[PDB]
RNA sequence: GAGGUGAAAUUCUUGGAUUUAUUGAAGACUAACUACUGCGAAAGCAUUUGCCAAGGACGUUUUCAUUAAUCAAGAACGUAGGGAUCGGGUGGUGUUUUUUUAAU
């Protein structure tokens, strides 16, 4: 379970960090627009499901 | 600062020692030349008084040290020490082998007033206290046991036991005579109209006259050898 | 004073010389609750165990202000003395319980300086038992790192926010606990770090402390619960021999 | 094995108090003042007066049996000096010298929160 | 009165020289089993000792002797219901536990003493995110285990009591439940590593859990203590119930 | 006030040198990082 | 930190005890060693030594408290007398300090004692009646008197000193 | 013995003064934080929390269109430059922060 937690944390922090920077620099929309992200939010899926929940 | 004055025409300070703790109990032997003094920590030094200096140390103990007593018959080979206590215990030492003979943890307050005698080495002892228990023991030389407790209702200070086998007790300005091997107060002085109580009993003429020094600054005489063959 | 001063009409009343009370007094020793270590804290004089205002009920009201370093053996908190109420006397050992806590005043008088603002809060909160506590909390502004200005002042509308969140979270930390649990979570100083973690979002907040717990109403005795806080015990025979 | 009293050294004006109590606070032991040692009425707040007062308290408390003293210095408090005078340090030096173990020196002088 | 229902001595009147009328009443009432004892405080009281037992309350033996001394020396006292399902409780294999009473909780208190030893050891070590509050939740800690917990009893399913611990409220916990539960396993691995490092007299072994469903990766550790008891440690986080509400 | 302005100049000097030094500069712990 | 090289040898080799400068709670703790340290009041004297130094007197003044043990250290406040609102408080500390410390040094050289003064709390160390003389001169000056009059009063008190 | 002073003295005190501890009541005040900082027309204003209204600055591609100022009588209450700081706003881009609970 030590090598399991090593491998699982090693792939998880990598995909979390790349999703965080991907939502932190997602400036371009195809028609001119700039997506407001908010500070230190980690995921496009997170803001998507948040804006679905705020209906 | 321990000092000794030779009472004779040379009234000079013969010996002077630097003891460890400020002490509040001394006893010399029934013979001469043995003086025991224990401080207010656990240390009971004993001193040969002729060429005055420490002959035994006796770290030994715990707490501040209550009254104590010798066991002295002239030209013996026994020479025990009694060693009462504040937290209730009696730890008997000898003086010929410097060893704790028997450890006894049984009491509940300051063990004032203990006494040692032999009746045919039998050597029965008796230890009173600020608790109301006088608690005599058989006290063999090798291994010891207990006998009766016989419970006087006082706060006994200097329970001078083994009169003619009859015990004494003081501590409410009440000099109770109590039989041994059974319990009955049989002689007991008049309770005064003060609150002050017995500080000390003092034997004169081989346990026949009794001096009584009070908590007040007075000192009385009893004549036990008449008032035991006499009630009150 | 001396012989040359005065008689002053008060020394004519005679003196009632000596009672020598320390031959009559009696030693007990105190047993602290078992949330701490080293529960023996010292000894206490009382009176002689007689009738007519006996010892076991002339007792059982007092408090003892012991130091937390004397309880824990660790000099990391030499301050923060506590007060133990002696409650149930049981066979020469005064079984005590928690009654209060206070900082030694030198610690807070050396903590407070100028060019920073301090925040106070205090709530009346009932525990999961029926004790009620005026529990306090002190807080201080941190000079932020890489700062330049001497001030580090709070805007006094941050002060209401910090005091609201600190009263809310320590009200939660009391109300989700009993008194023994409150002592065992106050000793290793953890609501301070909880305040700092939940309150570092709004302001940087130099060292947080609680500094006072005042009990204002006690439920009942519950002798069995007080014996459960230490360990059981059954006083039994000693030999008659008469 | 040691046992502990509590000093409650009062460094008042025109007087000095020292009386060790067992650490509850009820059973006081050997109340002395600065007045009951010196004979002048001018220096009953003397450092020497507090010195031999603390010496006599140390003797009586070693007679009773307490060996260490948690020491607590109190000034006169109130809307007054709020801070120990010389008699507090004098009694502190005296009973720190006189064979008595000392613990947890503090300051229990009352603070007013702006009374009258 | 269930508080002093099983107090094994009955303190009668105090002792004096003048034997009072209630002392004479107590002497003539009890007689051969009365005594006068000193208690630990120092007072002297007439009383009567009672050899307590687990299969009885002492009030049975007291009413037995205090009727066979007074109403009749042949009036037989018969009870068997108490003796039948007063020992349907399992008799815990302790020192003298048959002789002890049933209101004694000393097995639970010994377990809590071992828990306090483990409590101090788990506090005064060092973590990357230290323990905020460790607190037991187990059945022995609420005094409702079926058997009284004797040391080294493996086979009882109420052996491994559960203690939970909550860490500081740190924001750096991960998002989803499998990664935060895996981080809880990481913290438990750290504390058992340092426990086998510094305190070799204890021991640790992990355990999968399955009672909380649909996350097979919930892991507890179990401490086997040198006093003889075992504990099951569960990490709680502030993110847990809001993760479940997110789900 | 001169001492105040002097202390601010000292703090700005200290912060510029600290920023200059800042600009010029196992398994289970890898899993237990970032806390 | 700048005077730590002169503080500890009168705490180690002259006076027998041992020191630690705790950076935990930013304090100084003093032990006495049971093996060879004499003078059972030396712990208290060294504690009062570093107490005077951290209270504000200079280190030679604190050494003068360490040796010659009968010098005590009184402390009082501006706020106890006349309640001293802040403008008048500035007048008070400026009046006690004089100009270039000259009135404070006059009281220092006159009454054989040495004072230091914080923003609202002052401290005088010396012998006890010299503490009282300096304290009555200071409280007269803080009530507010002509400095020539307090100079003449200190000439009379220096005549009492001789 | 306490008080009190430069010394005293008056007073209080063995029906226990001072001091100690546990409380309880009463009114007034808000120690340190406290600054060349904040507010109000002025005198003045410092514990927390809530209510009731008001006010200032800022922000503004909002509205009205000279409604302004100055004061008897009356009325209510009693020369140019630079640095730093407080309140608001804009921009920058590092650490504090953190993440789908709201806030900013």
UniProtKB/Swiss-Prot annotation, chain A:
Full protein segment contained here: 180 to 234 of 297
Similarity-based family: Belongs to the RRP7 family.
Cystine pairs: none
Subcellular location: Nucleus, Nucleolus
Domain of life (superkingdom): Eukaryota
Summary of the function given for this chain in its UniProt record: Plays an important role in the synthesis of 18S rRNA but is not required for the 5.8S and 25S pathway. Is necessary for the cleavage at site A2. Is required for efficient association of RPS27 with the pre-ribosomal particle.
More details: Present with 2610 molecules/cell in log phase SD medium.
Residue runs in coiled coils: none
The protein's assembly and partners: Component of the 90S pre-ribosomal particle.
Organism: Saccharomyces cerevisiae (strain ATCC 204508 / S288c)
Official protein name in the record: Ribosomal RNA-processing protein 7
From Swiss-Prot, chain C:
GO molecular function, one term: structural constituent of ribosome
Chain positions covered by the region annotation Disordered: 1-18
SMART domains attached to this UniProt entry: Ribosomal_S3Ae
GO biological process annotation, one example: maturation of SSU-rRNA from tricistronic rRNA transcript (SSU-rRNA, 5.8S rRNA, LSU-rRNA)
Changes after translation: N-terminally acetylated by acetyltransferase NatA.
Any one GO CC term of the record: cytosol
Pfam families found in the cross-reference section: Ribosomal_S3Ae
Role summary: Component of the ribosome, a large ribonucleoprotein complex responsible for the synthesis of proteins in the cell. The small ribosomal subunit (SSU) binds messenger RNAs (mRNAs) and translates the encoded message by selecting cognate aminoacyl-transfer RNA (tRNA) molecules. The large subunit (LSU) contains the ribosomal catalytic site termed the peptidyl transferase center (PTC), which catalyzes the formation of peptide bonds, thereby polymerizing the amino acids delivered by tRNAs into a polypeptide chain.
Protein family membership: Belongs to the eukaryotic ribosomal protein eS1 family.
Assembly description: Component of the small ribosomal subunit (SSU). Mature yeast ribosomes consist of a small (40S) and a large (60S) subunit. The 40S small subunit contains 1 molecule of ribosomal RNA (18S rRNA) and 33 different proteins (encoded by 57 genes). The large 60S subunit contains 3 rRNA molecules (25S, 5.8S and 5S rRNA) and 46 different proteins (encoded by 81 genes). eS1 interacts directly with uS11 and eS26, which form part of the mRNA exit tunnel.
PANTHER family linked: 40S RIBOSOMAL PROTEIN S3A
From Swiss-Prot, chain D:
Record flagged with keyword Aminoacyl-tRNA synthetase: no
Annotated keywords: Acetylation, Cytoplasm, Nucleus, Ribonucleoprotein, Ribosomal protein, Ribosome biogenesis, rRNA processing
GO molecular function: mRNA binding; structural constituent of ribosome
One GO CC annotation: cytosol
Gene Ontology process terms (BP): cytoplasmic translation; maturation of SSU-rRNA from tricistronic rRNA transcript (SSU-rRNA, 5.8S rRNA, LSU-rRNA); ribosomal small subunit assembly; translation
Subcellular localization, as worded in the UniProt entry: Cytoplasm; Nucleus, Nucleolus
Free-text function comment from the UniProt entry: Component of the ribosome, a large ribonucleoprotein complex responsible for the synthesis of proteins in the cell. The small ribosomal subunit (SSU) binds messenger RNAs (mRNAs) and translates the encoded message by selecting cognate aminoacyl-transfer RNA (tRNA) molecules. The large subunit (LSU) contains the ribosomal catalytic site termed the peptidyl transferase center (PTC), which catalyzes the formation of peptide bonds, thereby polymerizing the amino acids delivered by tRNAs into a polypeptide chain.
Family per record: Belongs to the universal ribosomal protein uS11 family.
Protein name, entry field: Small ribosomal subunit protein uS11A
Entry PTM: N-terminally acetylated by acetyltransferase NatA.
UniProt miscellaneous comment: Present with 29600 molecules/cell in log phase SD medium.
Organism taxonomic ancestry: Eukaryota, Fungi, Dikarya, Ascomycota, Saccharomycotina
Gene: RPS14A
Organism: Saccharomyces cerevisiae (strain ATCC 204508 / S288c) (Baker's yeast)
UniProtKB/Swiss-Prot annotation, chain E:
Record field: transmembrane: none
Highest taxon, organism lineage: Eukaryota
Locations listed in the record: Nucleus, Nucleolus
Miscellaneous: Present with 3260 molecules/cell in log phase SD medium.
Assembly behavior: Interacts with snoRNA U3. Interacts with MPP10. Component of the ribosomal small subunit (SSU) processome composed of at least 40 protein subunits and snoRNA U3. Interacts with UBP10.
Record family assignment: Belongs to the NRAP family.
Function: Involved in nucleolar processing of pre-18S ribosomal RNA and ribosome assembly.
Name assigned to this protein: U3 small nucleolar RNA-associated protein 22
Species whose genome carries this gene: Saccharomyces cerevisiae (strain ATCC 204508 / S288c) (Baker's yeast)
């Amino acid at each position: 379970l030590k090598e399991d937690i090593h491998t699982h944390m090693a792939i998880f922090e990598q995909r979390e960090a790349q999703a965080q920077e991907d939502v932190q620099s997602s400036i371009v929309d195809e028609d001119g627009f700039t997506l407001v992200v908010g500070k230190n939010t980690k995921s496009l899926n997170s803001i998507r499901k948040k804006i679905l929940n705020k209906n | 600062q321990l000092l000794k004055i030779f009472h004779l025409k040379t009234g000079k300070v013969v010996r002077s020692m630097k003891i460890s703790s400020p002490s509040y109990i001394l006893d010399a032997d029934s013979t001469s030349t043995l003086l025991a003094v224990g401080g207010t920590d656990g240390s009971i030094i004993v001193v040969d008084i002729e060429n005055g200096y420490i002959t035994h140390s006796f770290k030994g103990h715990g707490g501040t040290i209550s009254s104590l007593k010798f066991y002295g018959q002239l030209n013996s080979k026994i020479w025990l020490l009694a060693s009462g206590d504040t937290n209730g215990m009696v730890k008997v030492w000898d003086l010929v082998k410097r060893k704790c003979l028997h450890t006894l943890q049984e009491h509940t307050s300051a063990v004032r007033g203990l006494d040692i005698i032999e009746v045919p080495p039998s050597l029965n002892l008796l230890s009173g206290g600020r608790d109301d228990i006088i608690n005599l023991w058989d006290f063999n030389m090798k291994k010891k046991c207990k006998l009766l407790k016989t419970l006087p209702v006082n706060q006994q200070v200097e329970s001078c036991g083994f009169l003619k086998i009859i015990y004494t007790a003081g501590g409410d300005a009440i000099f109770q005579l109590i039989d041994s091997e059974s319990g009955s107060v049989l002689k007991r002085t008049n309770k005064p109209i003060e609150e002050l109580f017995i500080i000390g009993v003092l034997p004169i003429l081989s346990n026949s006259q009794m001096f009584l020094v009070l908590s007040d600054q007075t000192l009385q005489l009893i004549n036990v050898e008449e008032d035991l063959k006499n009630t009150i | 004073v001396g012989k040359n001063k005065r008689l002053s009409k008060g020394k004519k009343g005679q003196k009632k010389r000596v009672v020598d009370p320390f031959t009559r007094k009696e030693w007990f020793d105190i047993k602290a609750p078992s949330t701490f270590e080293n529960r023996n804290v010292g000894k206490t004089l009382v009176n002689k165990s007689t009738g007519l205002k006996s010892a076991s009920d002339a007792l059982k009201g007092r408090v003892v202000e012991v130091c937390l370093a004397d309880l824990q053996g660790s000099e990391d908190h030499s301050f923060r003395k506590i007060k133990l109420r002696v409650d149930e006397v049981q066979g020469k050992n005064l079984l005590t319980n928690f009654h209060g806590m206070d900082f030694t005043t030198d610690k807070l008088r050396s903590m407070v300086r100028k060019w920073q603002t301090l925040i106070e809060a205090n709530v009346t909160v009932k525990t999961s038992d029926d004790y009620v506590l005026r529990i306090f909390a002190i807080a201080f502004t941190r000079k932020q790192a890489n700062q330049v200005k001497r001030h580090s002042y709070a805007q006094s509308s941050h002060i209401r926010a910090i005091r609201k969140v600190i009263s809310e979270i320590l009200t939660k930390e009391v109300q989700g606990s009993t008194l023994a649990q409150l002592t065992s979570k106050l000793i290793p100083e953890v609501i301070n770090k909880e305040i700092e973690n939940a309150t570092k979002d709004i302001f940087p907040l130099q060292n947080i402390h609680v500094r006072k717990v005042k009990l204002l109403k006690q439920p009942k005795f519950d002798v069995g619960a007080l014996m459960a806080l230490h360990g059981e015990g059954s006083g039994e025979e000693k030999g008659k021999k008469v | 094995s040691q046992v502990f009293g509590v000093a409650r050294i009062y460094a008042s004006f025109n007087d000095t108090f020292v009386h060790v109590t067992d650490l509850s606070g009820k059973e006081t032991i050997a109340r002395v003042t600065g007045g009951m040692k010196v004979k002048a009425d001018r220096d009953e707040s003397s450092p020497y007066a507090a010195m031999l007062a603390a010496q006599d308290v140390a003797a009586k408390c070693k007679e009773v049996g307490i060996t260490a003293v948690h020491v607590k210095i109190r000034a006169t408090g109130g809307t007054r000096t709020k801070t120990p005078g010389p008699g507090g340090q004098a009694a502190l030096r005296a009973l720190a010298r006189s064979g008595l173990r000392i613990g947890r020196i503090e300051d229990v002088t009352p603070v007013p929160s702006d009374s009258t | 009165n269930p508080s002093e229902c099983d107090k094994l001595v009955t303190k009668g009147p105090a002792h004096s020289e003048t034997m009072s009328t209630e002392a004479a009443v107590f002497k003539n009432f009890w007689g051969i089993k009365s005594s006068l004892r000193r208690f630990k405080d120092g007072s002297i009281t007439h009383c009567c000792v009672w050899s307590t037992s687990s299969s009885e309350p002492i009030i049975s033996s007291i009413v037995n002797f205090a009727l066979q001394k007074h109403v009749s020396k042949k009036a037989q006292i018969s009870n068997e219901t108490i003796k039948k399902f007063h020992n349907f409780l399992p008799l815990p294999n302790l020192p003298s536990s048959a002789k002890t009473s049933v209101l004694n909780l000393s097995s639970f208190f010994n377990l809590k003493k071992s828990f306090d030893d483990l409590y101090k050891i788990i506090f005064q070590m060092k973590l990357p995110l230290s323990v905020k509050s460790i607190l037991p939740v187990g059945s022995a800690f609420r005094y409702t285990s079926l058997c009284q917990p004797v040391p080294f009893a493996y086979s009882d399913p109420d052996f491994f009591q559960d203690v939970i611990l909550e860490f500081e409220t740190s924001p750096k916990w991960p998002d989803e439940i499998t990664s935060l539960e895996k981080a809880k396993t990481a913290f438990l691995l750290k504390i058992q590593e340092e426990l086998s490092a510094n305190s070799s007299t204890y021991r640790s072994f992990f355990s999968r859990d399955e009672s909380i469903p649909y996350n097979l990766e919930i892991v507890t550790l179990n401490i086997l203590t040198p006093e003889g008891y075992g504990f099951k440690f569960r990490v709680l986080t502030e993110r847990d119930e809001i993760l479940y509400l997110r789900a | 006030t001169q001492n105040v302005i002097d202390e601010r100049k000292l703090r700005v000097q200290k912060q510029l040198d600290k920023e200059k030094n800042i600009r010029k500069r196992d398994v289970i712990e890898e899993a237990l990082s970032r806390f | 930190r700048n005077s730590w090289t002169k503080i500890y040898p009168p705490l180690v080799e002259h006076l027998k005890l041992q020191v630690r400068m705790n950076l935990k709670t930013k304090s100084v703790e003093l032990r006495t060693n049971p093996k060879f340290t004499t003078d059972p009041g030396a712990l208290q004297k060294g504690a009062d030594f570093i107490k005077a130094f951290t209270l504000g007197f200079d280190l030679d003044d604190s050494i003068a408290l360490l040796r010659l043990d009968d010098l005590y250290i009184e402390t009082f406040e501006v706020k106890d007398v006349k309640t001293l609102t802040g403008d008048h408080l500035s007048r008070a500390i400026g009046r006690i300090a004089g100009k270039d410390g000259k009135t404070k040094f006059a009281i220092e050289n006159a009454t054989r004692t040495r004072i230091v003064l914080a923003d609202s709390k002052i401290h005088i160390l010396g012998g006890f009646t010299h503490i009282r003389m300096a304290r009555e001169s200071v409280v007269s000056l803080i009530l507010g008197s002509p400095p020539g009059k307090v100079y003449g009063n200190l000439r009379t008190v220096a005549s009492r000193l001789k």
